[PDB]
Every structure is written in structure tokens, then in C-alpha cells.
Design a protein around this nucleic acid. Structure first.
Lengths: 189, 197
DNA sequence: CTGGTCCGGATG
DNA sequence: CCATCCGGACCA
């Protein structure tokens, strides 16, 4: 095992790994919260997040994607939103946000794409939850959500991983080579 | 007006009150689920249920009726497996004044001591019941669970949980002379949604 | 940024 | 009749 505050990939779990349910992702240590989309500590940083199509105005290009904080009144740069922002290589700013100076110097975030994200993303898996590797927070900023109408904290994530992304030809070949398959819980119908 | 886990009549809504669609019954607080037949919480009890003819072997004498659990089957499907005394089925059984028994069911010691259930008869129940309304969904008042038991359904061959409900309400039943006069007196009519074409 | 359940309702 | 869509409220 690794501690709950482990940064980076989980030993033994390659990019392309796929689980049917969120609890499995949790048990694997890849994304500990069963429900929450962000795992972090507000004065440390964020270790992992889940893309499940929760915000209609988010975008995803695979290598880069935008992501939304949590919290229908205005969001604030506190708790998990604060945690994710601390990953950015830049001073914390809870008024206008910030852009990273050297984006790769930011703290790593494990990124999990859920099949539920298929309604806003062409990169979401067809089934279950897929570990897609390490991303970094390029910048973050507050804005009125186009689709929801209140203030949210938004983030730009960029992939920075030696493991090839699952949708690339190379990633696809690797998943096949390693026989990565959708994993159901032990003893499932 | 009242919390979602409220037992008993909804304030301001008399026996005989009638709405065209289930969502209206939900908004009135009388029967919260838009689709499901039973509203309850599995470790508390059941607050209400809807009689809409979903099970061909149910019977209804007005003051008493038998009722069937859900499950054993899309928001609606064909029956395909045995029902279990869990979730809403368990909730309804907890209303019975008796220890919970998920093997052979139980019979109340003091039936009136049971927790009250709001009962709504749907016009769809006319295929099994002479007491169902001609139209819409009618609040018929408070009933209590006399007993419950598992049995093979006569109409589809899988196990169902069955319940005997008996009326216990100071407001007269809508099909009695007195209830008919009261509905007229209170000008109770079929309510369509606001702005309905 | 779960997951299972469900005695509706419209449509053709 | 029937098959299919639609995709919400509620709770564990």
C-alpha cells in the first residue's frame, strides 16, 4: 500500500487500468473518495481527481482538459478547491486565481476518467473508470459557469506522464499487451 | 408543510382529494415518489402507498385490501425473480405491530397500534378493484398493516411479499354515503396541473 | 463528479 | 393491445 496522501502513480497500477465502480478505484488507492471528485488536503495539495461529466461547460482534449471545483451559491478557494490550486506552481490567489510559472514543476495529480463523462468528452471510456495517468495544474481561475449560472473555480490540467495515454496508438497497444480489462468486483454477477 | 418522513394525513388535504397525475400527488406531499408504489425508509417505516392494479392477484374490499411489495423484476419491467423483505418492502413490514420476520412474515398483536399509511387509489386499479376512482389518483385515508407474508404470485409464479391493509381513519371513506356527501360538501374535484391544456 | 430502484407518461 | 423513450425523486 501507499499512504492516503501519496502523490503520483500507484505502484502496480498502469495507465489504462479500468474498474466498474468507484469503490474499486478507492480500494486500489487510485482515488480514495467513494463519491467526491477530488482527493486532497487543503493545506497540502490534491492527489487525484475524477472526470465524470458533472459540469456541462467543461472541455477535454485528452492531453489537456478543464475541471471544476466543488461547492447553488458561489464556490470559494477553500477545502478541496484550495487543495487542487496548491498543486499549481504559483502563489495561491483566491481572488483571480493564478497561472503556473513552470507548469511541470507543479505537483502531480492522478486523473481518472469516468464513462459518465462521455456526455461532454470524447476521451471518456465506454465503461467504468479508467486511470489515465499524471496531470498538472497549469492554471486556475474563477468564472461564472456558462451552464449553471453561479461562480465556480476552474482549472486547466495538462498531462505529464511517461506512460502513454490510453487513447494513443501506443497506449492502446500497451493495454492489449498487458491484457488490461474492465475489472468488476470480486464475485460479481 | 411537513417533512418527507411524515406519518399520517397531510394537513389541508382531506380524504377524497383527487389529482390527475402522480407528480401532483408527489408535490402535494401525499405520495412523494413519482413512480414507485411505496414510500418508505427501510429502517423506519412506510408513509404511503399507491394502489394502481400492478398485481393481478390483489384484492380490495375498501375497508381492507391486500397489497404487494415491489421488486422481483427501465422504470417498470416484467417480473423475473423473487421479492425480498428489503428496502420499501421492509419499510412497510415495519409498520406492522409485530417483530420483523423476513422468512414467514408476521401478524400484528394490536393492528391499530401499527404505524399509519396514507393510501392512494389510482384509476389504473380499476382492473382489479371496484373501489378505485374513475379518474386520476384519490387519497382514501389512513390504513394500517394487519399482517404480511411471503407467497408465490398466482399471476406470475415468483415469490412476492404480501400485505393486508385495514382502514383506521376518522374521515369517512370516499365510497360511503357519508364520504360522498363530504366530497360534494367540500367541492372536491379532479385536479389537473396548473395551466393544463 | 455514487448507485440501485421504480404500481409513469407520452408516443407512434 | 405493445415496445421504446425519457432521465427525475428518493434512499442506502
Amino acid at each position: 500500500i501507499v499512504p492516503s496522501n501519496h502523490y503520483g502513480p500507484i505502484p502496480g497500477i498502469p495507465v489504462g487500468s479500468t474498474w466498474r465502480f468507484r469503490v474499486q478505484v478507492s480500494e486500489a488507492g487510485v482515488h480514495r473518495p467513494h463519491v467526491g471528485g477530488i482527493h486532497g488536503r487543503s493545506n497540502d495539495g490534491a492527489y487525484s481527481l475524477v472526470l465524470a461529466g458533472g459540469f456541462a461547460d467543461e472541455v477535454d482534449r485528452g492531453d489537456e482538459f478543464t475541471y471544476t471545483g466543488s461547492g447553488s451559491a458561489d464556490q470559494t478557494l477553500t477545502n478541496m478547491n484550495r487543495a487542487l490550486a496548491l498543486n499549481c506552481d504559483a502563489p495561491l490567489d483566491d481572488k483571480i486565481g493564478a497561472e503556473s510559472r513552470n507548469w511541470r514543476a507543479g505537483k502531480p495529480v492522478r486523473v481518472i476518467r469516468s464513462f459518465k463523462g462521455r456526455k461532454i468528452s470524447k476521451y471518456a471510456p465506454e465503461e467504468g473508470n479508467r486511470y489515465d495517468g499524471i496531470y498538472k495544474v497549469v492554471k486556475y481561475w474563477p468564472e461564472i459557469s456558462s451552464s449553471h449560472g453561479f461562480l465556480v473555480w476552474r482549472y486547466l490540467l495538462r498531462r505529464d506522464d511517461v506512460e502513454p495515454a490510453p487513447w494513443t496508438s501506443e497506449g492502446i497497444e500497451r493495454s492489449r499487451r498487458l491484457c488490461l480489462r474492465l475489472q468488476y468486483p470480486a464475485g460479481y454477477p
